[PDB]
Amino acid sequence: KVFGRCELAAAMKRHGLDNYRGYSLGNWVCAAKFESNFNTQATNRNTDGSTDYGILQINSRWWCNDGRTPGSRNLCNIPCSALLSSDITASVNCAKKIVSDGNGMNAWVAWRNRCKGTDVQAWIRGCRL
Ligand SMILES: [Cl-]
Ligand SMILES: [Cl-]
Ligand SMILES: [Cl-]
Ligand code: NA
């Protein structure tokens, strides 16, 4: 599923990401835009053989099991395929664990390089929330 901007904002808000660990909703929408272009089915292979999955591009090296990343962990205790569902519950719940692990949203390279320090509120502007 390819989400609309305000559509995703609403879903993220309902699932409790607004101001989660101090990150306003605009940050999460901005991250999703540049990580996946709002596409739940997005995948990208990394150099070390790991793969990033879903609307927030969560990495199989640490966070989920795809059965082809030897020596990796599964800290969200889920199959990576679950991160590709039209239902973003699994991605959000796993994202909550990631952002809590000490490094905040710097875990998402696209957020650091394209969202951090910008007017992120613009990403939920006009949305009925
Ligand atoms: Cl915001
Ligand atoms: Cl594996
Ligand atoms: Cl933080
Ligand atoms: Na893994």
Side-chain angles (χ1 to χ4, degrees):
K1 173 176 180 177
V2 182
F3 275 84
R5 178 175 64 88
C6 292
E7 184 186 12
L8 180 64
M12 282 177 163
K13 183 163 181 60
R14 174 166 67 89
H15 282 288
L17 280 183
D18 190 18
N19 297 124
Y20 191 88
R21 276 270 175 159
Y23 289 94
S24 63
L25 189 59
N27 285 283
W28 298 100
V29 176
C30 186
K33 174 65 178 178
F34 293 126
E35 287 290 349
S36 71
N37 202 32
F38 297 148
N39 185 5
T40 61
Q41 295 196 77
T43 63
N44 286 285
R45 186 91 102 135
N46 301 312
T47 56
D48 70 340
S50 63
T51 303
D52 299 332
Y53 294 89
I55 200 167
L56 284 169
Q57 288 293 275
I58 290 167
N59 192 349
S60 65
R61 173 61 179 84
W62 302 106
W63 304 112
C64 64
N65 179 61
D66 61 7
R68 68 168 202 184
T69 312
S72 63
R73 308 209 66 171
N74 182 5
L75 291 175
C76 292
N77 299 316
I78 51 169
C80 295
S81 59
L83 298 171
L84 303 177
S85 175
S86 53
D87 187 328
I88 65 169
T89 300
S91 284
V92 170
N93 286 345
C94 186
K96 284 179 177 174
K97 303 193 181 187
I98 298 171
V99 71
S100 294
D101 76 345
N103 300 275
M105 286 198 70
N106 292 294
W108 287 274
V109 61
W111 178 83
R112 199 178 341 106
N113 289 333
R114 306 182 75 172
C115 300
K116 191 178 188 180
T118 72
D119 180 28
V120 293
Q121 194 279 335
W123 287 100
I124 55 174
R125 196 184 310 282
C127 298
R128 199 175 300 111
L129 297 169

Short mmCIF file of all heavy atoms in Angstrom, two decimals, residues 70-104:
data_model
loop_
_atom_site.label_atom_id
_atom_site.label_comp_id
_atom_site.label_asym_id
_atom_site.label_seq_id
_atom_site.Cartn_x
_atom_site.Cartn_y
_atom_site.Cartn_z
N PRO A 70 22.79 -14.28 8.06
CA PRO A 70 23.52 -15.07 9.05
C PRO A 70 24.17 -14.23 10.14
O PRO A 70 24.80 -13.21 9.85
CB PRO A 70 24.60 -15.77 8.21
CG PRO A 70 24.06 -15.81 6.84
CD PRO A 70 23.23 -14.57 6.68
N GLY A 71 24.02 -14.66 11.39
CA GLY A 71 24.63 -13.98 12.52
C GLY A 71 23.86 -12.77 13.01
O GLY A 71 24.32 -12.06 13.90
N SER A 72 22.68 -12.54 12.44
CA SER A 72 21.86 -11.38 12.80
C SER A 72 20.98 -11.66 14.02
O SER A 72 20.89 -12.80 14.48
CB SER A 72 20.98 -10.96 11.62
OG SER A 72 20.06 -11.98 11.28
N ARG A 73 20.34 -10.61 14.52
CA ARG A 73 19.41 -10.74 15.64
C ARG A 73 17.98 -10.46 15.18
O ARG A 73 17.75 -10.02 14.05
CB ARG A 73 19.80 -9.79 16.77
CG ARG A 73 21.26 -9.91 17.20
CD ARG A 73 21.45 -9.55 18.66
NE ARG A 73 20.78 -10.51 19.54
CZ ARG A 73 20.92 -10.54 20.87
NH1 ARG A 73 21.72 -9.67 21.48
NH2 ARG A 73 20.26 -11.45 21.58
N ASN A 74 17.03 -10.73 16.06
CA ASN A 74 15.61 -10.51 15.80
C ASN A 74 14.98 -9.84 17.01
O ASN A 74 14.15 -10.43 17.70
CB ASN A 74 14.92 -11.83 15.46
CG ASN A 74 13.45 -11.67 15.12
OD1 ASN A 74 12.93 -10.55 15.04
ND2 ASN A 74 12.76 -12.79 14.92
N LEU A 75 15.39 -8.60 17.27
CA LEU A 75 15.05 -7.93 18.52
C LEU A 75 13.59 -7.52 18.63
O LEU A 75 13.08 -7.34 19.73
CB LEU A 75 15.95 -6.69 18.69
CG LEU A 75 17.43 -6.97 18.96
CD1 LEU A 75 18.23 -5.68 19.00
CD2 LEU A 75 17.63 -7.75 20.25
N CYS A 76 12.90 -7.37 17.50
CA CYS A 76 11.47 -7.08 17.53
C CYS A 76 10.65 -8.38 17.49
O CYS A 76 9.42 -8.35 17.53
CB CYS A 76 11.06 -6.17 16.37
SG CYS A 76 11.72 -4.50 16.51
N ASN A 77 11.35 -9.51 17.41
CA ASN A 77 10.73 -10.84 17.45
C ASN A 77 9.62 -11.00 16.41
O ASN A 77 8.51 -11.42 16.73
CB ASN A 77 10.17 -11.12 18.84
CG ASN A 77 11.24 -11.12 19.91
OD1 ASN A 77 12.32 -11.68 19.72
ND2 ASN A 77 10.96 -10.48 21.04
N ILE A 78 9.94 -10.68 15.16
CA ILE A 78 8.99 -10.77 14.07
C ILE A 78 9.67 -11.20 12.78
O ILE A 78 10.86 -10.93 12.58
CB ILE A 78 8.29 -9.42 13.80
CG1 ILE A 78 9.33 -8.31 13.65
CG2 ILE A 78 7.31 -9.10 14.92
CD1 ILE A 78 8.77 -7.00 13.13
N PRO A 79 8.92 -11.87 11.89
CA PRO A 79 9.44 -12.06 10.54
C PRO A 79 9.45 -10.73 9.79
O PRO A 79 8.52 -9.94 9.96
CB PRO A 79 8.45 -13.05 9.91
CG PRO A 79 7.19 -12.85 10.67
CD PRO A 79 7.59 -12.47 12.07
N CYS A 80 10.48 -10.49 8.99
CA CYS A 80 10.61 -9.21 8.28
C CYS A 80 9.42 -8.95 7.35
O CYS A 80 9.06 -7.80 7.12
CB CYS A 80 11.91 -9.18 7.48
SG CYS A 80 13.43 -9.23 8.49
N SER A 81 8.82 -10.02 6.84
CA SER A 81 7.68 -9.89 5.93
C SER A 81 6.51 -9.15 6.58
O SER A 81 5.72 -8.49 5.90
CB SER A 81 7.23 -11.27 5.45
OG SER A 81 6.85 -12.08 6.54
N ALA A 82 6.39 -9.27 7.90
CA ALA A 82 5.31 -8.61 8.63
C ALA A 82 5.41 -7.09 8.54
O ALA A 82 4.43 -6.38 8.74
CB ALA A 82 5.32 -9.05 10.08
N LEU A 83 6.61 -6.60 8.23
CA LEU A 83 6.84 -5.16 8.11
C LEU A 83 6.36 -4.61 6.77
O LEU A 83 6.40 -3.40 6.54
CB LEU A 83 8.32 -4.84 8.30
CG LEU A 83 8.89 -5.22 9.67
CD1 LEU A 83 10.40 -5.07 9.68
CD2 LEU A 83 8.27 -4.37 10.76
N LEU A 84 5.89 -5.49 5.89
CA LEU A 84 5.46 -5.09 4.55
C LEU A 84 3.94 -5.01 4.42
O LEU A 84 3.42 -4.69 3.35
CB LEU A 84 6.03 -6.06 3.51
CG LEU A 84 7.55 -6.21 3.51
CD1 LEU A 84 7.97 -7.25 2.49
CD2 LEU A 84 8.25 -4.88 3.23
N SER A 85 3.23 -5.28 5.51
CA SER A 85 1.77 -5.29 5.49
C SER A 85 1.19 -3.90 5.27
O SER A 85 1.83 -2.89 5.56
CB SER A 85 1.23 -5.88 6.79
OG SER A 85 -0.18 -5.80 6.84
N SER A 86 -0.04 -3.85 4.76
CA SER A 86 -0.76 -2.59 4.60
C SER A 86 -1.11 -2.03 5.97
O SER A 86 -1.33 -0.83 6.13
CB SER A 86 -2.02 -2.79 3.75
OG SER A 86 -2.82 -3.84 4.28
N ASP A 87 -1.16 -2.92 6.96
CA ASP A 87 -1.33 -2.55 8.36
C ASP A 87 0.04 -2.23 8.97
O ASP A 87 0.91 -3.09 9.02
CB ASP A 87 -2.00 -3.70 9.13
CG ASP A 87 -2.37 -3.33 10.55
OD1 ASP A 87 -1.67 -2.51 11.18
OD2 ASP A 87 -3.38 -3.87 11.06
N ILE A 88 0.22 -0.99 9.44
CA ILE A 88 1.54 -0.55 9.89
C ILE A 88 1.82 -0.84 11.36
O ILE A 88 2.81 -0.36 11.91
CB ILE A 88 1.75 0.97 9.65
CG1 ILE A 88 0.79 1.80 10.51
CG2 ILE A 88 1.58 1.30 8.16
CD1 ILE A 88 1.11 3.29 10.52
N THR A 89 0.96 -1.62 12.01
CA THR A 89 1.10 -1.88 13.44
C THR A 89 2.46 -2.48 13.78
O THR A 89 3.12 -2.03 14.72
CB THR A 89 -0.01 -2.82 13.96
OG1 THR A 89 -1.30 -2.23 13.73
CG2 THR A 89 0.15 -3.09 15.45
N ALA A 90 2.88 -3.48 13.02
CA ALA A 90 4.15 -4.16 13.29
C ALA A 90 5.33 -3.22 13.12
O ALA A 90 6.27 -3.24 13.93
CB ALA A 90 4.30 -5.37 12.39
N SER A 91 5.30 -2.40 12.08
CA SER A 91 6.39 -1.45 11.83
C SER A 91 6.47 -0.41 12.94
O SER A 91 7.56 -0.08 13.40
CB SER A 91 6.20 -0.76 10.48
OG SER A 91 6.56 -1.62 9.42
N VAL A 92 5.32 0.10 13.38
CA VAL A 92 5.28 1.11 14.42
C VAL A 92 5.79 0.54 15.75
O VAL A 92 6.60 1.17 16.43
CB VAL A 92 3.86 1.68 14.61
CG1 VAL A 92 3.78 2.56 15.86
CG2 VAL A 92 3.45 2.49 13.39
N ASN A 93 5.30 -0.64 16.12
CA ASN A 93 5.71 -1.26 17.38
C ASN A 93 7.21 -1.52 17.42
O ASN A 93 7.85 -1.36 18.47
CB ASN A 93 4.94 -2.56 17.61
CG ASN A 93 3.50 -2.32 18.01
OD1 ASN A 93 3.12 -1.21 18.38
ND2 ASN A 93 2.69 -3.37 17.93
N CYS A 94 7.77 -1.93 16.29
CA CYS A 94 9.20 -2.18 16.19
C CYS A 94 9.98 -0.87 16.21
O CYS A 94 11.01 -0.76 16.86
CB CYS A 94 9.53 -2.98 14.93
SG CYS A 94 11.25 -3.51 14.80
N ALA A 95 9.46 0.14 15.52
CA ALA A 95 10.08 1.46 15.50
C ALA A 95 10.19 2.03 16.92
O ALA A 95 11.17 2.69 17.25
CB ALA A 95 9.28 2.41 14.62
N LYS A 96 9.19 1.75 17.74
CA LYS A 96 9.19 2.23 19.12
C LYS A 96 10.37 1.66 19.90
O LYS A 96 10.94 2.34 20.75
CB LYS A 96 7.87 1.87 19.81
CG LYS A 96 6.70 2.74 19.39
CD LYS A 96 5.42 2.31 20.09
CE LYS A 96 4.26 3.23 19.73
NZ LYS A 96 2.97 2.74 20.28
N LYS A 97 10.73 0.41 19.62
CA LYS A 97 11.86 -0.22 20.28
C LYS A 97 13.18 0.38 19.80
O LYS A 97 14.11 0.58 20.58
CB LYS A 97 11.86 -1.73 20.04
CG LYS A 97 10.59 -2.43 20.49
CD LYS A 97 10.78 -3.94 20.53
CE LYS A 97 9.51 -4.66 20.96
NZ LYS A 97 9.74 -6.12 21.15
N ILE A 98 13.26 0.66 18.50
CA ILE A 98 14.48 1.19 17.89
C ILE A 98 14.82 2.57 18.46
O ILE A 98 15.94 2.81 18.89
CB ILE A 98 14.34 1.28 16.35
CG1 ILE A 98 14.13 -0.11 15.76
CG2 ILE A 98 15.58 1.94 15.73
CD1 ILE A 98 13.77 -0.11 14.28
N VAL A 99 13.84 3.46 18.45
CA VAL A 99 14.06 4.84 18.86
C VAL A 99 14.34 4.93 20.36
O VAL A 99 14.81 5.96 20.86
CB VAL A 99 12.85 5.73 18.47
CG1 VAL A 99 11.64 5.41 19.34
CG2 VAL A 99 13.21 7.21 18.56
N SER A 100 14.06 3.85 21.08
CA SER A 100 14.24 3.82 22.53
C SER A 100 15.61 3.30 22.95
O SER A 100 15.94 3.29 24.14
CB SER A 100 13.15 2.96 23.18
OG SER A 100 11.87 3.53 23.02
N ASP A 101 16.43 2.87 21.99
CA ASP A 101 17.63 2.10 22.31
C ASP A 101 18.86 2.95 22.61
O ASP A 101 19.94 2.42 22.86
CB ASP A 101 17.94 1.13 21.16
CG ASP A 101 18.57 1.81 19.95
OD1 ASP A 101 18.52 3.05 19.85
OD2 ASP A 101 19.12 1.08 19.10
N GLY A 102 18.70 4.28 22.58
CA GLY A 102 19.76 5.19 22.97
C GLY A 102 20.12 6.26 21.95
O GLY A 102 20.53 7.36 22.33
N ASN A 103 19.97 5.94 20.67
CA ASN A 103 20.40 6.84 19.60
C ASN A 103 19.26 7.61 18.94
O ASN A 103 19.47 8.35 17.97
CB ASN A 103 21.16 6.05 18.54
CG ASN A 103 22.39 5.37 19.10
OD1 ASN A 103 23.46 5.97 19.20
ND2 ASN A 103 22.24 4.11 19.49
N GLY A 104 18.05 7.45 19.46
CA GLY A 104 16.90 8.19 18.96
C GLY A 104 16.65 7.92 17.49
O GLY A 104 16.86 6.81 17.02
#
